[PDB]
């Protein structure tokens, strides 16, 4: 399930 916390920014 897609989620904007995970995927609306690139995290490293």
């Amino acid at each position, epitope marked *: 399930i*897609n989620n*904007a*916390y*995970n*995927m*609306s*920014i*690139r995290r490293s």
Partner: antibody
Amino acid sequence: QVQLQQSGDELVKPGASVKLSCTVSGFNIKDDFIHWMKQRPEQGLEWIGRIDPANGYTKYAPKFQDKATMTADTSSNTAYLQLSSLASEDAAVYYCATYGVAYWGQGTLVTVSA
Amino acid sequence: DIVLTQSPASLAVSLGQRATISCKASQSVDHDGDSYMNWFQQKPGQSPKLLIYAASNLESGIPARFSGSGSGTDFTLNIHPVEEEDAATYYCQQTNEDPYTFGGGTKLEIK
């Protein structure tokens, strides 16, 4: 569940500094960046930078490196944006955002005149 | 910086028809199989509202009339059928590399 409540509109004098706030409810700000965006009147959006409230680490867009200072208080779940040496091009609506960039504050208008 | 160029800057569409907005990036906004392109809607006096993230994912609360596609450097927002409440300015945004950048906006009007 998440709301960002920004501080009230401010008219500031050239040369002065101002500090805006962004109080977050429904979300522990230790758990994500808070981002700040600028929108000049009738213009487009610019990203100013982000702060990681857990450790205070910040990353600014280069054009705001000397203009903006971001801080955060994890106990009050509040983030602050300080703008220095105000000039007319600093007049804008400033937004905070978090949960990636999914949830935004209602904006704070800064106008600059004297 | 990654420069985002949105097309068209002004778009007039009839109710019921399909609106398409394009965002071209000067460099890739992909990393390891994910595209970091967002689309926002903004009405006057209101905060930008996230529509689509990671190029094609529909944000909670947004109807499926909105859809996103593309990868790499070329991305597209489609709205259909267009309804009165879609009149707004739309922005693309990339969040792959710093500084994050926005396109210059597309104003959607009803014809």
